[PDB]
């Protein structure tokens, strides 16, 4: 009787599970580490902070190695509830990582929205909004402190921390480009907001202090780090109006071992908008009422999970003139691939194809080395934009090969690739081993 | 690591002792069922 | 700054940093075996349609098989809320065999149970997007659906099928499609005139290995530790009044089982594991004068309100003796999945584990039913005396009573998830232990 | 074409990825484990169960190790839907674990609220709510069975399971104090509820049984476990009504290598209220209509996310006169700090600073040893409580340096330290190696 | 087999070499004389070896 | 009212003799073959 | 396009207004490879 009724139930079939045990689940031993301390301090921003301005900072050398970087902003909004959409992510137009005078990486505001669309998953996404947007029905005049963490290869894991103590001859600098237009703060669509406040910014870095034995090794010994880079060029779309399903053959310019390719179809005038707008709830400003306008989104709910508003019909990738895999409809890349490779939900209009089994991690799990692929092409077919966006009956009531007339505003195709490289640290100077 | 259970392993012993075309190397055979 | 605590090293912290073994900030990543991943289409042998059974033979394009996703194209016949996971209820079942030898089989009700029990967070929401309409889509809307399969080799590359070494025994999937899909060709019991037949295609993700690994796979034997799902349907009956019935169900399971899971469902409305009631989301028209408790507001069929559940308590017995003292059903719906999985389980789905961490694949404790002569699941039901149409009682009665509409949850589905071993020698293989 | 085309795209950038490999991803390894069985039996309670009563239970030594303790309550509520907020958790007021006559770990209902608010970060938090509160609009007169799991050092991972088989001479006891005032069952705010029945309670404990061969060896060997404990003392707030951003310098009384400090600002009357109340949706009883009252919460929505309602502006930790890190704003400690440290959502009003890289885990990853630090302080600076809680224009439309006039109702301060020490068990007796 | 569908033919090892493969269709048109133009040729949209 | 097609694929097979089949299956072969490579694109026909 | 006097009576540098519907560009290339059959297996010796 009781638990022992199972314990004694020792047969032949279970032996391969319990004979000659190696592991006991009930007696854990923890590995011992080397003493360290974490400290988070601000650096001086060199340059005027503001809309359309570019500033830089040099990481103050308060640590042995750098693990994380967070950009803090103070913004005041000129609009009300629902008029903003990641205003802090839009403002952070791009960030460049520079080590010793040469470029290592550069992320763009759109890339941050895409990363959030693909790899930052669970309710943790809600914090991201909380750190970057107005999520409590705030009104005009409210001022808020925002936290835009950076996502360089060394920002999510201590394992690739930048060992500044070992780079005593090279400077590491962060270049921040601030957007000229931020929705809801100094512009509402294209209309300037009179009296909009100039933003304030500070840059904070999390430093690690190591003890005597470990920091000596870091300072004297060479290092080889396996690091990640972002490759990006912004492309143009050919979204069709009616009677045809246009296609494009976008020639890709990538090199190095690639984890995955991701892309989105953006409306350059409305940051983070990757789908069509429609007279249905959350799909446009005023949706459901007589004031509904399908040319302007209900910004705070710009992102949707409504497939009918996504423009892509189908895609295939060719490498050196050959099919890489068979043609899928757009609904494949924003569902099956993030499901199998990440395990979260990707908003409509953002698509991913992985080469990696676990692209969300750092341990290489398969790559596409474009150093041996001479002609890589992304072939896209668009759905026909024949649905009247103003008719809920037509938007929530039609077929897989069509979308709304407002999808033609998605004029920009943003194609991203993440790759591996090697950051060698030798005699106090750093650099990447493979350059292209 | 696996014990031989006389009530559960018979179906396995049967199939792994089933006649299969293991001598079809460089043979002119009319029918080969999708070997690989 | 940070040096202020770094120097503050003592006596009791020697157990944390004395004679370190690891350092957190210089991680060395392991070098792996070169491979490529590709997903290609398989052809379906047979006519695809409602109520039809078709089969797919998986071609020998790659070295290993990992993800398989079944793509279905459906047109809805109803408005928003008239559907509830159409893609996976159509996928009535999938049978896996190697050379004619059955390895496993999953049922539509299991896919709903697994999605309801083990898949969690936004991952499950994405799943919903893959199997259902989640934007209040209307009549005539077309959507392409993806139903990932969950066989032992589908969720981790580490258990992928060694086609290299499975030369003489082909891998096949038999697909049984439902005759009735709610909101697509039927609305309740009523046929939807003009409903289109489903289009289906089976996608298989192949792994291609490089030169030395392929050789190793071709020449070396393999032992893979795999899962099986054991199932057969049962019948139950819950009384309306004056009593709480008990039922003793004789279980017929074998092999090292890491958990048992079960539900009580309405056999007509797919995925209904609770009673329907005139409260929000609990029936069609709920909250209005038109509310009817015999038809669900299908898109919200799943609920978390256990007062609509039928089970009062449950106990598992082994060879005539109690395994544990009888506990109320809410333990098995809310606490066991907290302990064993970490997610949230909707009402009407119940779990009891034998393993510490059954959600994972690394074995963590089993009950081998092959040494048990009598395994019995003992149930006690709630008395179905609440008038489902009166929120005053549905949202306000005692824990030992449930809705009068709970008497329709007569289909008892008990699942067992176990281990077996897939052993491959000389170009062929199969499962070592049968029963 | 396809995968073989990709497979051969092999070159110089692969030598550090696929060259001279150590592992593959296509053959997993299972381990053979010590044979065990899991059991769960009910423990009796010695003492009278009721509101305000102190009861205790001794864990019957039926098994070899204890892994999980879940306390059951049966409650009937006297209020309507939305008038309760974790009534099972408020009721489980004090819990402490005693080994052989000595206390080694104590937890409070406010801590449980903080843990649920800080480390439960998905479906788990919802499921926790499901088993501790009502979540389906239930009406007055409803009764429900609640499951409040305990979080001692051994209640989440089997690796630290308490080995009763090695404690041949010690009693292991659970001491409980049940709250006298539980919102929605005995009191509605401060007013007593007529017809408030006493709870039914019992404690269920999950036992582990080991196979005879390893159980004998396990029982005979001495053991050491690296475990975590909670340290806690109460404090008081310093929240002004106007013109001043008040400061208080709190002297801390903690010992042992600590993973993190966490604190909240609590209304002592309304359990779990860590923010101001305001006439905005979900922020007070009747919010949004003419009956809105900002002195009584909408209890079922007590936990909110709008930091505008926070009382704390900034905080800084100091060790022996030195700044541990530079002064940061309360939004830092609520939003981005847990983003970096645990990876999930934290409601407003709950703050932490983590010394550990990942305190959510059990593997030690950096600690602050308060047994060697003599004078650690926590400096708090409050917001000016100049917002009129009844006017959405001011509650939703103001700056971050001010808070609601109702924040002054937040008079209790709770500071927690979660920390490491070692549990030693030899010859049938055990206890902690180090005091405090 | 149907319009817009995709099927495959696996080649049985019926002979020693395989040389000439012809795809056979039965079609009925709904239009009049002059309304078709290689209807069996467009019918086969993508054939892969 | 358009009917679905009937499809059949017919294959012309070559049968060889005793000595030829023995050698043919046993020896390696290298055939010089044709391939078609193709991706469709979009043109630029002007208006006026 | 509707007047044959204009379509049949012009120069090499112009065409019909209806010509703008010829929007699909199809460029084909026919090439050599080697089909190498050794030990019961076939395939392409040279390909990218």
DSSP string, C235-266: E----SSS---EEEEEP---SEEEEEEEEEE-
What's D13's DSSP letter?
G
Tell me, in Å, the resolution of the deposited structure: 3.8
Record: contact B32-E13, CB cut-off 8 A:
yes
d(CA D128, CA D133): 8
Dihedral (C-alpha) D224, D230, D233, D234: value to the nearest 10 degrees? -170
**In Å, how far from its chain's centre is CA C75?**
25
Nearest residue, CB atoms, F30 vs list G25, G31, G36: G36
A326, two tokens: 């068979």
Record: contact F24-B26, CB cut-off 8 A:
no
Q: Annotate C118-144 with three-state secondary structure.
A: CCCCHHHHHHHHHHCCCCCCCCCCEEE
Asked if D12 is an interface residue toward chain G (Cβ–Cβ < 8 A), one would say no
Record: contact A335-C80, CB cut-off 8 A:
no
Q: Are the beta carbons of D31 and A22 closer than 8 angstroms?
A: yes
DSSP-based three-state secondary structure for A34: coil
Q: Are the beta carbons of A69 and A93 closer than 8 angstroms?
A: no
d(CA A252, CA A239): 19
For A324, the closest chain G residue by CA position comes to: G48
Record: contact F28-G38, CB cut-off 8 A:
yes
How many beta carbons lie within 10 A of that of residue A28, not counting itself? 15
Q: Is C430 exposed, middle or buried (0-12, 13-18, 19+ CB in 10 A)?
A: buried
d(CA A118, CA A116): 5
Q: Annotate C146-162 with three-state secondary structure.
A: EEECCCCCCCCHHHCEE
C170: chain B residues, CB-CB within 8 Å: 34
HSE (CB half, 13 Å, CA atoms) of A104?
A: 28
Nearest residue, CB atoms, E25 vs list F1, F7, F20: F7
Reported in sequence order, the residue ranges of D150-237 that DSSP labels E, i.e. its strands, are 172-178, 187-188, 191-192, 200-210, 223-236
Q: Which residue has the tokens 């349609």?
A: C49
Distance from the first to the final alpha carbon of chain D: 67
d(CA G10, CA D353): 83
**Contacts of B among chains (3+ CB pairs under 8 A):** A, C, E, F, G
d(CA A64, CA A163): 6
For G48, the closest chain D residue by CA position comes to: D5
C421: chain B residues, CB-CB within 8 Å: 2
CA distance, residue F28 to nearest chain A CA (Å): 27
Q: Are the beta carbons of A156 and D340 closer than 8 angstroms?
A: no
d(CA A6, CA C323): 8
Backbone angles phi, psi at A84, to 5 degrees: -120, 155
Q: How far is CA D15 from CA A256, A420, C208, in A?
A: 12, 12, 19
DSSP-based three-state secondary structure for D384: strand
G24: chain F residues, CB-CB within 8 Å: 40-43
HSE (CB half, 13 Å, CA atoms) of D313?
A: 19
Helices (H), chain E: 39-43
Helix (H) or strand (E) holding C379: strand C375-381
Helices (H), D161-241: 212-220
HSE (CB half, 13 Å, CA atoms) of A372?
A: 16
Record: contact C3-A336, CB cut-off 8 A:
no
Q: Which residues contact C161 (CB under 8 A, 6 or more apart)?
A: C64, C65, C66, C153, C171
Asked if D7 is an interface residue toward chain G (Cβ–Cβ < 8 A), one would say no
**Which of F22, F25, F28 best tests the B interface by mutation, with the highest count of B CBs <10 A?**
F25
Chains F and C touch each other (3 or more Cβ pairs < 8 A): no
CA distance, residue C344 to nearest chain E CA (Å): 41
CA nearest A104: which of A203, A178, A171, A159? A171
DSSP-based three-state secondary structure for D353: strand
Helix (H) or strand (E) holding D76: strand D65-76
Rounded to a whole number of angstroms, the CA Rg of chain D reads 25
Residue A369, strand partner residues: A257
HSE (CB half, 13 Å, CA atoms) of A199?
A: 30
CA nearest D271: which of D188, D383, D345? D188
Asked if D18 is an interface residue toward chain G (Cβ–Cβ < 8 A), one would say no
Q: Are the beta carbons of D80 and D119 closer than 8 angstroms?
A: no
Asked if D1 is an interface residue toward chain G (Cβ–Cβ < 8 A), one would say yes
DSSP-based three-state secondary structure for A208: strand
d(CA A286, CA A295): 11
Q: Are the beta carbons of D195 and D26 closer than 8 angstroms?
A: no
Q: Are strands D54-58 and D172-178 parallel, antiparallel or unpaired?
A: antiparallel
**Which of B28, B29, B32 best tests the F interface by mutation, with the highest count of F CBs <10 A?**
B28
D312, two tokens: 């704390």
Q: Are the beta carbons of D25 and C32 closer than 8 angstroms?
A: yes
Asked if A301 is an interface residue toward chain F (Cβ–Cβ < 8 A), one would say no
Asked if D365 is an interface residue toward chain C (Cβ–Cβ < 8 A), one would say yes
Method used to obtain the model: cryo-EM
d(CA D29, CA C223): 10
Q: Which string of b and e fits F1-28 if b means at least 16 CB within 10 Å? A: eeeebebeeeeeeeeeeeeebeeebeee
Backbone angles phi, psi at F22, to 5 degrees: -60, -55
Gaps in chain C (C to N distance exceeding 2.5 A) after: none
d(CA C46, CA C55): 7
Q: Which residue has the tokens 């098989």?
A: C65
Q: Which residues contact G14 (CB under 8 A, 6 or more apart)?
A: none
Asked if D194 is an interface residue toward chain A (Cβ–Cβ < 8 A), one would say no
F24: chain B residues, CB-CB within 8 Å: 28
F41: chain A residues, CB-CB within 8 Å: 247, 249
- The pairs formed by A354-357 with CB atoms below 8 angstroms and a separation of 24 or more are A354/A259, A354/A260, A354/C37, A355/A258, A355/A259, A355/A260, A355/A261, A355/C36, A355/C37, A355/D6, A356/A259, A356/A260, A357/C37, A357/C157, A357/D25
**In Å, how far from its chain's centre is CA D214?**
35
Q: What is the secondary structure of C164-223 as a DSSP string?
A: GG-SSS-EEEEEEE-S--BTTTEETTEE-TTPPPPEEEEEEEEEEE-HHHHHHHHHS-EE
d(CA A300, CA A290): 20
Asked if A247 is an interface residue toward chain F (Cβ–Cβ < 8 A), one would say yes
d(CA D304, CA D297): 11
- The pairs formed by B2-5 with CB atoms below 8 angstroms and a separation of 24 or more are B2/A15, B2/A16, B2/C223, B2/C421, B2/C423, B2/C432, B3/A12, B3/A13, B3/A15, B3/A16, B4/A12, B5/A11, B5/A12, B5/A13, B5/C433
Asked if D11 is an interface residue toward chain C (Cβ–Cβ < 8 A), one would say no
d(CA D289, CA D279): 9
Helix (H) or strand (E) holding A313: strand A312-319
G34: chain F residues, CB-CB within 8 Å: 30-33
DSSP-based three-state secondary structure for A333: helix
A54, two tokens: 């570019």
d(CA A90, CA A179): 7
F 27-46 residues inside an 8 A Cβ radius of B: none
Helices (H), A119-169: 124-132
C329, two tokens: 């059903």
Helix (H) or strand (E) holding A37: strand A36-43
C150: chain A residues, CB-CB within 8 Å: none
Q: Which residues contact A299 (CB under 8 A, 6 or more apart)?
A: A82, A83, A84, A85, A183, A184, A270, A285
d(CA D294, CA C416): 53
Q: Is E15 exposed, middle or buried (0-12, 13-18, 19+ CB in 10 A)?
A: middle
A285, two tokens: 């400003």
Q: What is the secondary structure of A224-279 as a DSSP string?
A: EEEEEEEEEEEEE-----SS---EEEEEP---SEEEEEEEEEE-TTSTT--S---S
What's D332's DSSP letter?
I
B2: chain A residues, CB-CB within 8 Å: 15-16
**Contacts of C among chains (3+ CB pairs under 8 A):** A, B, D, E
d(CA C71, CA A328): 10
Asked if G31 is an interface residue toward chain D (Cβ–Cβ < 8 A), one would say no
Record: contact F16-E17, CB cut-off 8 A:
yes
Asked if B23 is an interface residue toward chain F (Cβ–Cβ < 8 A), one would say no
d(CA A83, CA A299): 5
């Amino acid at each position: 009787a009781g638990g022992l009724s199972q314990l004694v139930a020792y047969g032949a079939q279970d032996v391969y599970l319990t004979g000659n045990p190696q592991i006991t689940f009930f007696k854990t031993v923890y590995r011992r580490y080397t003493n360290f301390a974490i400290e988070s301090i601000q650096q001086t921003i060199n340059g005027s902070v503001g809309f359309g301005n570019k500033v830089s900072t040099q990481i103050s050398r308060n640590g042995d190695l750098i693990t994380d970087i967070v950009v803090e902003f103070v913004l005041t909004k000129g609009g009300n509830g629902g008029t903003t959409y990641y205003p802090a992510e839009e403002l952070l137009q791009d960030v460049e990582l520079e080590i010793g005078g040469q470029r290592i990486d550069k992320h763009y505001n759109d890339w941050f929205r895409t990363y959030d669309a693909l790899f930052r998953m669970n309710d943790d996404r809600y914090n991201y909004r909380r750190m970057t947007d107005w999520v409590n029905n705030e009104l005009v005049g409210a001022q808020k402190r925002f936290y835009v963490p950076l996502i360089f290869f060394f920002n999510q894991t201590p394992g690739l921390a930048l060992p500044l103590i070992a780079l005593q001859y090279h400077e590491v600098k962060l270049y921040f480009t601030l957007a000229s237009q931020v929705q809801g703060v100094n512009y509402n669509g294209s209309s300037a907001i009179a009296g909009a406040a100039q933003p304030t910014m500070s840059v904070w870095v999390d430093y690690i202090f190591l003890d005597t034995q470990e920091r000596t090794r870091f300072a004297q010994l060479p290092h080889e780090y396996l690091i990640e880079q972002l490759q990006f060029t912004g492309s143009e779309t050919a979204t069709p109006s009616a009677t045809t399903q246009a296609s494009q053959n976008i020639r890709l310019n990538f090199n190095h071992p690639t984890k995955y390719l991701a892309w989105n179809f953006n409306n350059p005038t409305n940051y983070g908008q990757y789908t069509a707008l429609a007279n249905i709830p959350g799909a446009c400003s005023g949706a459901g009422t007589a004031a509904a306008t399908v040319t302007t989104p209900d910004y705070g709910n710009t992102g949707t999970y409504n497939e009918q508003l996504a423009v892509l019909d189908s895609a295939k990738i060719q490498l050196n003139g050959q099919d890489r895999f068979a043609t899928r409809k757009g609904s494949y890349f924003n569902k099956v691939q993030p499901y199998q490779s990440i395990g979260g939900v990707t908003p409509a209009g953002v698509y991913l194809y992985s080469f990696a089994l676990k692209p969300a991690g750092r341990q290489p799990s398969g790559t596409c080395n474009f150093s041996r692929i001479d002609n890589a092409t992304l072939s896209l077919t668009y759905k026909t934009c024949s649905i009247d966006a103003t008719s809920p009956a037509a938007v929530l009531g039609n077929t897989e090969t069509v979308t709304a007339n407002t999808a033609t505003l998605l004029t920009a195709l943003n194609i991203y690739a993440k790759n591996y490289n090697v950051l060698r640290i030798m005699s106090g100077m750093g650099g990447l081993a493979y350059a292209n | 690591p696996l014990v031989d259970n006389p009530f559960s392993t018979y179906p396995y012993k049967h199939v792994i002792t089933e006649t299969q075309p293991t001598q079809a190397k460089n043979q002119a055979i009319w029918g080969l069922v999708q070997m690989g």
